[PDB]
PDB file of N, CA, C and O and ligand atoms in Angstrom:
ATOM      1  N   UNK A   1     121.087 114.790 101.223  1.00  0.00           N
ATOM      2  CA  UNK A   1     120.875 113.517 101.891  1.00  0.00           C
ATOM      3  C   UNK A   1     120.394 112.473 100.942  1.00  0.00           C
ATOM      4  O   UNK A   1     120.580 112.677  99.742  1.00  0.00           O
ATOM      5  N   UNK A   2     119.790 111.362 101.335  1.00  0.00           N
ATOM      6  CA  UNK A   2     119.327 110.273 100.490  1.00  0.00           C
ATOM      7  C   UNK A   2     118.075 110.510  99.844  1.00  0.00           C
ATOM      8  O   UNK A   2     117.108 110.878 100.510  1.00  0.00           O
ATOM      9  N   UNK A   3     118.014 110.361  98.808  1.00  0.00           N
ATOM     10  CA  UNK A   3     116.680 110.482  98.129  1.00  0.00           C
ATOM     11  C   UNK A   3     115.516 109.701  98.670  1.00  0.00           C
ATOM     12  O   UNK A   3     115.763 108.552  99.036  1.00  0.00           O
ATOM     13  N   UNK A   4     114.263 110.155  98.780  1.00  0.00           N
ATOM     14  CA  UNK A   4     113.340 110.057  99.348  1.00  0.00           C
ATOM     15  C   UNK A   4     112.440 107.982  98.732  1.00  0.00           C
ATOM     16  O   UNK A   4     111.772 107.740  97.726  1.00  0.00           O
ATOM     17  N   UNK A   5     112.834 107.099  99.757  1.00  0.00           N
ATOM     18  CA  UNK A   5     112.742 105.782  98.915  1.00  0.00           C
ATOM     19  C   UNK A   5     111.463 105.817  98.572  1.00  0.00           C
ATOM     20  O   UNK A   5     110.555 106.525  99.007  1.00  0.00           O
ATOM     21  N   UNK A   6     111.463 104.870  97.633  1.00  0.00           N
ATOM     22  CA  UNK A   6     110.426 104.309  97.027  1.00  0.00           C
ATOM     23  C   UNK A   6     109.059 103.458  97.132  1.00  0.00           C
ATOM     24  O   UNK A   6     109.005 102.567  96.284  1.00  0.00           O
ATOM     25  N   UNK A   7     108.003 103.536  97.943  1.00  0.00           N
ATOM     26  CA  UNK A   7     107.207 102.542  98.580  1.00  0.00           C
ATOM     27  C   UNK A   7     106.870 101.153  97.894  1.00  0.00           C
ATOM     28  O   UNK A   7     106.241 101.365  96.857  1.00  0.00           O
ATOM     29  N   UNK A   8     107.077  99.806  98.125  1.00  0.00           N
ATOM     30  CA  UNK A   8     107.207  98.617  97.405  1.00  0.00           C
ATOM     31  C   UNK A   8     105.664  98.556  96.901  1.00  0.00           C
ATOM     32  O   UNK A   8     105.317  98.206  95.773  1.00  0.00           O
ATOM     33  N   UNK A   9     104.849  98.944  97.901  1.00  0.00           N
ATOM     34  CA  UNK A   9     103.766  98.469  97.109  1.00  0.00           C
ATOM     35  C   UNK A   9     102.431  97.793  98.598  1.00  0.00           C
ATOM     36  O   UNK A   9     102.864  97.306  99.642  1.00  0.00           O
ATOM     37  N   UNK A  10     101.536  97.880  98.430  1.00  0.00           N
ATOM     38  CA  UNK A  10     101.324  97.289  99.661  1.00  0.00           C
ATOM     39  C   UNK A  10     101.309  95.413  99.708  1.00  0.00           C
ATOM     40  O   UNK A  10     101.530  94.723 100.704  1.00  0.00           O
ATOM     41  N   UNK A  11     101.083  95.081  98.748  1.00  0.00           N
ATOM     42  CA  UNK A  11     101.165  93.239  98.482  1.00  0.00           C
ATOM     43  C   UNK A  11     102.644  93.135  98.424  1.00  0.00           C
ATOM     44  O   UNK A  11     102.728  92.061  97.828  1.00  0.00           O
ATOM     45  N   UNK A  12     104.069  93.571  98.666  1.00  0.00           N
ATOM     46  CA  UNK A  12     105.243  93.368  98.803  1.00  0.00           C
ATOM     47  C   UNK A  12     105.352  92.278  99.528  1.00  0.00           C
ATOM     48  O   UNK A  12     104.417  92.076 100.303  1.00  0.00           O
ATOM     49  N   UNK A  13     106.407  91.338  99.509  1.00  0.00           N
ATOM     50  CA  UNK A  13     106.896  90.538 100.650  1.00  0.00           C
ATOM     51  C   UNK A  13     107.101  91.566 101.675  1.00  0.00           C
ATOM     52  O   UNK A  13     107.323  92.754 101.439  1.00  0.00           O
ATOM     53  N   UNK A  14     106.997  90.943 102.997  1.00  0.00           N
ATOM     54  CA  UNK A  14     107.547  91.076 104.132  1.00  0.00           C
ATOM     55  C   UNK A  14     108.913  91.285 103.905  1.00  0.00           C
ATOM     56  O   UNK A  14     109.120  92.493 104.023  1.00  0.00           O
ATOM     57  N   UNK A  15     109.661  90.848 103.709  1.00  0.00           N
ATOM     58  CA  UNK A  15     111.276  91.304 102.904  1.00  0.00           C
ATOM     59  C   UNK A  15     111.559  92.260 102.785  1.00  0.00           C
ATOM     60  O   UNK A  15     112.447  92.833 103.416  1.00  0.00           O
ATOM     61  N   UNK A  16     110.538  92.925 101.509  1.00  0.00           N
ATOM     62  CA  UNK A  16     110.847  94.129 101.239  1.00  0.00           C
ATOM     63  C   UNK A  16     110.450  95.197 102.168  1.00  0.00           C
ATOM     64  O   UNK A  16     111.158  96.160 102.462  1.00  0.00           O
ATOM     65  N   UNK A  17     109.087  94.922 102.676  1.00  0.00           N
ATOM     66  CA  UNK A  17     108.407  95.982 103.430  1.00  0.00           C
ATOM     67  C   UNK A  17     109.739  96.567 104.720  1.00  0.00           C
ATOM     68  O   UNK A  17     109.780  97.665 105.275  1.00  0.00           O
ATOM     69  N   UNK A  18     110.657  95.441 104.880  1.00  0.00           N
ATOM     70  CA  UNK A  18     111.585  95.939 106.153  1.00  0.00           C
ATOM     71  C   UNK A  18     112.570  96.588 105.518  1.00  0.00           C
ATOM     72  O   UNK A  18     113.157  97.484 106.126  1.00  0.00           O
ATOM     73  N   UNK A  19     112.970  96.230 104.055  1.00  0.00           N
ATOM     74  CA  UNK A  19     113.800  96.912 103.320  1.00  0.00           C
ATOM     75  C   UNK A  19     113.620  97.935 103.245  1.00  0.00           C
ATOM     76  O   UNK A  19     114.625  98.638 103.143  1.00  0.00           O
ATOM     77  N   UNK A  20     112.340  98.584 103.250  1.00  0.00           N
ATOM     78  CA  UNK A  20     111.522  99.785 103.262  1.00  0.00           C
ATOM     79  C   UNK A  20     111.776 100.671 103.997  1.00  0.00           C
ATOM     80  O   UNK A  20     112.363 101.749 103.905  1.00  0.00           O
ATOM     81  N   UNK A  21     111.103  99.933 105.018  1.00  0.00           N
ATOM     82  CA  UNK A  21     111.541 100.235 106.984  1.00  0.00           C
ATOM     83  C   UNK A  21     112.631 101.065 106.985  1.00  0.00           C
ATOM     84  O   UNK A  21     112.759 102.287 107.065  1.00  0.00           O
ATOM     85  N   UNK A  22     113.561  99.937 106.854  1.00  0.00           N
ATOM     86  CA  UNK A  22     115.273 100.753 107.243  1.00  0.00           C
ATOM     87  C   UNK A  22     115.489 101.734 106.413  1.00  0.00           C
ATOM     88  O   UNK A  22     116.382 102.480 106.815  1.00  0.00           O
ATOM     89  N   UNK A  23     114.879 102.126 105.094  1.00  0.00           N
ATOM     90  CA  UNK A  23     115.498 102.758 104.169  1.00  0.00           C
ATOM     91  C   UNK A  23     114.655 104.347 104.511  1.00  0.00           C
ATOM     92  O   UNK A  23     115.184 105.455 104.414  1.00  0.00           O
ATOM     93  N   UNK A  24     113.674 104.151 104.796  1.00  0.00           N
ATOM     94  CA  UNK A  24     112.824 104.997 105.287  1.00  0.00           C
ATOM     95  C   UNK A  24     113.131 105.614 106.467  1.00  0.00           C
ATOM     96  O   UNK A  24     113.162 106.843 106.515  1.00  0.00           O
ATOM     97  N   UNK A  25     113.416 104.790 107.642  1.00  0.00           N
ATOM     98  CA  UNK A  25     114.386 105.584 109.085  1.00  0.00           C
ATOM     99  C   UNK A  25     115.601 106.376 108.743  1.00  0.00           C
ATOM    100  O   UNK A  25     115.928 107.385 109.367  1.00  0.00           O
ATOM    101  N   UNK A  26     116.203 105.927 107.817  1.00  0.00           N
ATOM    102  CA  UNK A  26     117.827 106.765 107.317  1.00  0.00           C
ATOM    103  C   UNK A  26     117.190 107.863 106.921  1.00  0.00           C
ATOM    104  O   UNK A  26     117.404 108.838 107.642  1.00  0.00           O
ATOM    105  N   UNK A  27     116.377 108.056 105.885  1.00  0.00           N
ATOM    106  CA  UNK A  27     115.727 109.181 105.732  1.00  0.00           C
ATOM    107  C   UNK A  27     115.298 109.887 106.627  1.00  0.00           C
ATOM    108  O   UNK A  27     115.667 111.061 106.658  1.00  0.00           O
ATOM    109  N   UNK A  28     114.527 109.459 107.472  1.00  0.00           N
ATOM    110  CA  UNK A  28     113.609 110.409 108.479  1.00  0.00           C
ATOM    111  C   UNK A  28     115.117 111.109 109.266  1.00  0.00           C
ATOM    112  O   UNK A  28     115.413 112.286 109.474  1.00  0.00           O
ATOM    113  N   UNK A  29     115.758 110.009 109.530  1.00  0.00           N
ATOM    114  CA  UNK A  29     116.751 110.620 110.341  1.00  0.00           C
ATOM    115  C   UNK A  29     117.312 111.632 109.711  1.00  0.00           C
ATOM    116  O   UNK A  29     117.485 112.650 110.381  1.00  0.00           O
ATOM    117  N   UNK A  30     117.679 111.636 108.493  1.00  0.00           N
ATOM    118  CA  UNK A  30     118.506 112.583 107.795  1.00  0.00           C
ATOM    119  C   UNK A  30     117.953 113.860 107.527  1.00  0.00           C
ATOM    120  O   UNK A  30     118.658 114.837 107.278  1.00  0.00           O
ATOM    121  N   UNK A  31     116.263 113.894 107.585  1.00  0.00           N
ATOM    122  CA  UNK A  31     115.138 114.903 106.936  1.00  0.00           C
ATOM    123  C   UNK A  31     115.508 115.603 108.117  1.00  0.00           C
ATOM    124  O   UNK A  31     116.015 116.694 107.855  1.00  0.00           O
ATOM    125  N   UNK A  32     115.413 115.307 109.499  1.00  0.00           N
ATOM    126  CA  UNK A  32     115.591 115.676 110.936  1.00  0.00           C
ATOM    127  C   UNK A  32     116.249 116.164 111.482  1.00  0.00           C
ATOM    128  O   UNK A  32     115.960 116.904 112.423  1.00  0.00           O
ATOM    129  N   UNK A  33     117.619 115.859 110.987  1.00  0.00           N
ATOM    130  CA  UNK A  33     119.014 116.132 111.262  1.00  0.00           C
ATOM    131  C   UNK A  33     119.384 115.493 112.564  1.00  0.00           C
ATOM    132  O   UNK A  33     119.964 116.178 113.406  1.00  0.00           O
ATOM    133  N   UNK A  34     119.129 114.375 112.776  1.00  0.00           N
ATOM    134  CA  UNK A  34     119.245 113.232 113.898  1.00  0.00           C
ATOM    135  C   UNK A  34     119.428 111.720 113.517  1.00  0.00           C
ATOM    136  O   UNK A  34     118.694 110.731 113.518  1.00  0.00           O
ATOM    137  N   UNK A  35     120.993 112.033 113.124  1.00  0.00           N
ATOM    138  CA  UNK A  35     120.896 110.260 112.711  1.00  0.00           C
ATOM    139  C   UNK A  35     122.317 109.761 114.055  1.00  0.00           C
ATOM    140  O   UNK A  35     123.517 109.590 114.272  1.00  0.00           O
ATOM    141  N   UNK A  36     121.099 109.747 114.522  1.00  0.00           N
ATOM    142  CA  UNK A  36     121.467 108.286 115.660  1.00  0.00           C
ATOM    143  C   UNK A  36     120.210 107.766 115.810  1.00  0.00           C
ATOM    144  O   UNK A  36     120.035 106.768 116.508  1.00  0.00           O
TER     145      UNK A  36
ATOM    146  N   UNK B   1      95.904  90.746 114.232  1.00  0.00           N
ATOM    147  CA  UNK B   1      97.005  91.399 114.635  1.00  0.00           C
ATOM    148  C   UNK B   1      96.415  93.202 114.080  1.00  0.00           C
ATOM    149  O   UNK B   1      95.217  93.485 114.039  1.00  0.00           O
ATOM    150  N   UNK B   2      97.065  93.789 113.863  1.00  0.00           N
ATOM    151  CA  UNK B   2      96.340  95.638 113.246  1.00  0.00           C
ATOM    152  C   UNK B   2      96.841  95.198 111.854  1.00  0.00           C
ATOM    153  O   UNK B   2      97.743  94.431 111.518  1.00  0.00           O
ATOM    154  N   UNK B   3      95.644  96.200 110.909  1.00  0.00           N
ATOM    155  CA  UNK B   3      95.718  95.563 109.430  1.00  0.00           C
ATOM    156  C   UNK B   3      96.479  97.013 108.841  1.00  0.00           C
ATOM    157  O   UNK B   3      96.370  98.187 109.196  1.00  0.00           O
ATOM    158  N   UNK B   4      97.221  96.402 107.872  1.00  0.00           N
ATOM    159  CA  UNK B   4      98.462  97.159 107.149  1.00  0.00           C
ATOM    160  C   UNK B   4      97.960  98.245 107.300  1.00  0.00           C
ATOM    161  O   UNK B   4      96.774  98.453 107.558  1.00  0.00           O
ATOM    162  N   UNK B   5      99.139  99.353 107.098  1.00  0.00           N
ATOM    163  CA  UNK B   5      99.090 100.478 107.728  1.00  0.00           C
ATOM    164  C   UNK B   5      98.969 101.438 105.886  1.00  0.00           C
ATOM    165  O   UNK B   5      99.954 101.347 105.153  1.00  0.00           O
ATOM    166  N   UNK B   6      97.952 102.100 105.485  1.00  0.00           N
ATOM    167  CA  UNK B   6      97.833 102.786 104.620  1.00  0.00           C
ATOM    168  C   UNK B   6      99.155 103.900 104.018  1.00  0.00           C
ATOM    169  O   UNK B   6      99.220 104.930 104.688  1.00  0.00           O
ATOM    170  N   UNK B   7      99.893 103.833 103.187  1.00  0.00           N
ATOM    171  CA  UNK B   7     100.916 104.772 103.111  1.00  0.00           C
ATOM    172  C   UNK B   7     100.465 106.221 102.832  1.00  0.00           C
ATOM    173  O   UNK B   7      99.511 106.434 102.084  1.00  0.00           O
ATOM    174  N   UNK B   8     101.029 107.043 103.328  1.00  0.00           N
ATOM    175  CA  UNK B   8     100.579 108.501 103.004  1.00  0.00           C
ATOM    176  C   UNK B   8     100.766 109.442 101.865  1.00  0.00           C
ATOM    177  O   UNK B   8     100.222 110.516 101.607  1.00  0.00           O
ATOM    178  N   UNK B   9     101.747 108.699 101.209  1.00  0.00           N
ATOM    179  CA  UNK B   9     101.445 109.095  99.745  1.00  0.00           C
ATOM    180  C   UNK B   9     103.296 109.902  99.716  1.00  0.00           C
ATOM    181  O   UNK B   9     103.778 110.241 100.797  1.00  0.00           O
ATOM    182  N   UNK B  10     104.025 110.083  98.546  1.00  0.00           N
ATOM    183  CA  UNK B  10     105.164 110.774  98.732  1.00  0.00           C
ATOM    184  C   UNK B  10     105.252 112.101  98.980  1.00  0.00           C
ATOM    185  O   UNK B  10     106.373 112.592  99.110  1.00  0.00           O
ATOM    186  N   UNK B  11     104.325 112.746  99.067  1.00  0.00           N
ATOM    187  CA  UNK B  11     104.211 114.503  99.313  1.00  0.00           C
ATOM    188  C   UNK B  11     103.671 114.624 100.183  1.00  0.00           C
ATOM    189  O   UNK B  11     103.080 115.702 100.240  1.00  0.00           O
ATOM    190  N   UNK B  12     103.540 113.918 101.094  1.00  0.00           N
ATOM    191  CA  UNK B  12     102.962 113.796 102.705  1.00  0.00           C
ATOM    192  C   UNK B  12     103.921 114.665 103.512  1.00  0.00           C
ATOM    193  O   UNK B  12     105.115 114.465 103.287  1.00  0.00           O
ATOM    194  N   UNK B  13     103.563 115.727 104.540  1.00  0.00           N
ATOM    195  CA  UNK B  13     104.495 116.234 105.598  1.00  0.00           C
ATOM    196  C   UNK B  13     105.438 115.269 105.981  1.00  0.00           C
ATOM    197  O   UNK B  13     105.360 114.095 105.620  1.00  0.00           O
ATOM    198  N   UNK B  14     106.277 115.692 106.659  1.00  0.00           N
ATOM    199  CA  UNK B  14     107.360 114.729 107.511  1.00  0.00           C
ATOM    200  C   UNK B  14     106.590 114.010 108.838  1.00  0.00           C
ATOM    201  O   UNK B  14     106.525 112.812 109.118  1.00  0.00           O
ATOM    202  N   UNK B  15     106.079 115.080 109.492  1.00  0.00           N
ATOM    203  CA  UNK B  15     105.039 114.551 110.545  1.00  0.00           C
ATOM    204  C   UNK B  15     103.937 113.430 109.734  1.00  0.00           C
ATOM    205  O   UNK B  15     103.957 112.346 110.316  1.00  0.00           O
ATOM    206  N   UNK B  16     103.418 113.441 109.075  1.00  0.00           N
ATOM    207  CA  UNK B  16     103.032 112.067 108.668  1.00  0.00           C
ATOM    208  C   UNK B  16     103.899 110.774 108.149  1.00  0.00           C
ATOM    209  O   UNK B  16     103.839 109.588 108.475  1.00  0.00           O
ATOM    210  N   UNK B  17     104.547 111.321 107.418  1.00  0.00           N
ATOM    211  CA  UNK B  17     105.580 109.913 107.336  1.00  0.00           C
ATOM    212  C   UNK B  17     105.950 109.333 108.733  1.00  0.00           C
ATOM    213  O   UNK B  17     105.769 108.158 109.053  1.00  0.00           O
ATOM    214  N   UNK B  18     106.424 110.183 109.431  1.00  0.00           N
ATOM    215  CA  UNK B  18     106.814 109.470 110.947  1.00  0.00           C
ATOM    216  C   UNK B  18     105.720 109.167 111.361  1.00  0.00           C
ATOM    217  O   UNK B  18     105.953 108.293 112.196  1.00  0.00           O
ATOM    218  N   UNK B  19     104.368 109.372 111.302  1.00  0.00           N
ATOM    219  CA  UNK B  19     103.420 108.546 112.095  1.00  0.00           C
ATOM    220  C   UNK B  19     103.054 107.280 111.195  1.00  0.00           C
ATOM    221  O   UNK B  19     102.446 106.366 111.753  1.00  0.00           O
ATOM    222  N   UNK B  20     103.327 107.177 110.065  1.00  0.00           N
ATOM    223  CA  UNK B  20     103.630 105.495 109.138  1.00  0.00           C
ATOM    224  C   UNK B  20     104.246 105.129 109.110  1.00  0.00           C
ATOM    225  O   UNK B  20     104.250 104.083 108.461  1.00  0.00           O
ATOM    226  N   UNK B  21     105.607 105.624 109.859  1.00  0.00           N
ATOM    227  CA  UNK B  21     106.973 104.749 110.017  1.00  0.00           C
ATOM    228  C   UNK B  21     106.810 104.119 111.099  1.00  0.00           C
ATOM    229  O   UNK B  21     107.345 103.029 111.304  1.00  0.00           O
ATOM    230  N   UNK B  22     105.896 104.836 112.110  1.00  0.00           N
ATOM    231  CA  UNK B  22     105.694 103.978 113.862  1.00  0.00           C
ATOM    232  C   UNK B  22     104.516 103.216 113.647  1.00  0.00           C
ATOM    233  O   UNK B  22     104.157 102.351 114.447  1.00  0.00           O
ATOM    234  N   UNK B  23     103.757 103.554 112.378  1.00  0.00           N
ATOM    235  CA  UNK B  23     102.531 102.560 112.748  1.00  0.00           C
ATOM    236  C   UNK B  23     103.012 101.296 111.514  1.00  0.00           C
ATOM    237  O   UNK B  23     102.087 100.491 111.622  1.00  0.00           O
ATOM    238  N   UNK B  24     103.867 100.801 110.547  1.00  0.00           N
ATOM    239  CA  UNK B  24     104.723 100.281 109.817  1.00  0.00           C
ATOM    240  C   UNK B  24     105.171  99.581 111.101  1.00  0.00           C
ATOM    241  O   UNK B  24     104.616  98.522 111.392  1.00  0.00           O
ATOM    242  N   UNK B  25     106.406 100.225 112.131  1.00  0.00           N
ATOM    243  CA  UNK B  25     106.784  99.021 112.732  1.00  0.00           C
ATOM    244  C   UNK B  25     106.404  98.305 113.556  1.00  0.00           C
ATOM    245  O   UNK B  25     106.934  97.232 113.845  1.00  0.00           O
ATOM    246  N   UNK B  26     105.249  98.866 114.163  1.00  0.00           N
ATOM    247  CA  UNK B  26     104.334  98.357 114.808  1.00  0.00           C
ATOM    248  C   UNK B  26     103.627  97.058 114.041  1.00  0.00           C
ATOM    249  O   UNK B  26     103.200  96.159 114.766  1.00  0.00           O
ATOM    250  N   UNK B  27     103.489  96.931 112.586  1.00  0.00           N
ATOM    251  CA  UNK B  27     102.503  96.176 112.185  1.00  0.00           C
ATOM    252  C   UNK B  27     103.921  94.852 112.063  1.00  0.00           C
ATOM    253  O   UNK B  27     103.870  93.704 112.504  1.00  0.00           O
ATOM    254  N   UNK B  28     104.889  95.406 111.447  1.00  0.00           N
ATOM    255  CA  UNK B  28     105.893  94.221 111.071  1.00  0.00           C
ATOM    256  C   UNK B  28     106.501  93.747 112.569  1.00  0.00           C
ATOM    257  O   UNK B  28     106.628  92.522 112.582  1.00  0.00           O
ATOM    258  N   UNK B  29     106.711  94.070 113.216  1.00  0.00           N
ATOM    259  CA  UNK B  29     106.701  93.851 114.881  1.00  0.00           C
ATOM    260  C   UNK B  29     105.457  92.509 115.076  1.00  0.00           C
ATOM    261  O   UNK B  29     105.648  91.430 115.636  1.00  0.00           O
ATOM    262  N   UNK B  30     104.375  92.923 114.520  1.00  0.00           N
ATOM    263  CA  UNK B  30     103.356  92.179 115.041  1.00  0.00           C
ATOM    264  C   UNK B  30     103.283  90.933 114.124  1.00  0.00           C
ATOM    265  O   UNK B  30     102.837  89.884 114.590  1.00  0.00           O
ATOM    266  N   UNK B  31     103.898  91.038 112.243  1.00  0.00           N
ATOM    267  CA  UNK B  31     103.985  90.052 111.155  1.00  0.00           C
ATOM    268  C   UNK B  31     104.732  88.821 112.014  1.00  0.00           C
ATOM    269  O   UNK B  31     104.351  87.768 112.524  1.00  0.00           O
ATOM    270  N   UNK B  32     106.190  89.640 111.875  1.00  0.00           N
ATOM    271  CA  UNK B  32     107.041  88.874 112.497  1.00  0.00           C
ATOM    272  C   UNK B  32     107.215  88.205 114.169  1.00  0.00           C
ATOM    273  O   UNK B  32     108.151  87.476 114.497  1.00  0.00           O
ATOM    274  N   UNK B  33     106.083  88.648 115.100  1.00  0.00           N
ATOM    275  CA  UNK B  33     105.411  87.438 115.953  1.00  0.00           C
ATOM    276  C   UNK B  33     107.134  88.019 116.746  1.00  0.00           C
ATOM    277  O   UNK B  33     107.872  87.046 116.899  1.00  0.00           O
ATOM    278  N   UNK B  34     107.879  89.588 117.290  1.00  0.00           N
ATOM    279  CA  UNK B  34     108.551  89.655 117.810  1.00  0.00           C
ATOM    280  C   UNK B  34     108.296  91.498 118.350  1.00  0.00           C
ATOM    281  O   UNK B  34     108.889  92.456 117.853  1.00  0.00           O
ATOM    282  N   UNK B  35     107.409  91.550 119.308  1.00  0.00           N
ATOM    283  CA  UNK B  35     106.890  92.864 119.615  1.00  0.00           C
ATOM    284  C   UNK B  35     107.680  93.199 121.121  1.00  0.00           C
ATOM    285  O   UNK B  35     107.213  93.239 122.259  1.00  0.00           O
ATOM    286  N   UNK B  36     108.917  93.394 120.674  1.00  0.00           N
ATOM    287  CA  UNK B  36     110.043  94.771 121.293  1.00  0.00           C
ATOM    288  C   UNK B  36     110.654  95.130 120.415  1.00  0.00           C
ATOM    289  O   UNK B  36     111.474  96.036 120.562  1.00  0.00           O
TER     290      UNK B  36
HETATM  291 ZN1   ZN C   1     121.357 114.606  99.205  1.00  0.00          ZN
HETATM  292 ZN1   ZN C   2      94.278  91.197 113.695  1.00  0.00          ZN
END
């Protein structure tokens, strides 16, 4: 599956932090075996 | 609004990441002033 992302940092833009977000749900979903 | 949500570090269980992924969208939910 996708490699496990990278955390921006906690002072990140808001930007990134959602970039985060989404990149982080694909994962969980994928760790889970539930991607919907 | 709830103050940033502490990350759990990359060798955190899965069960913790998912409880910083819900408390994450909870906080950007609350940044972005759009809580559904
Ligand atoms: Zn892989
Ligand atoms: Zn507050």
């Amino acid at each position: 599956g996708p490699s496990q992302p990278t955390y921006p940092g906690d002072d990140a833009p808001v930007e990134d932090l959602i970039r985060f977000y989404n990149d982080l749900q694909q994962y969980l979903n994928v760790v889970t075996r539930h991607r919907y």
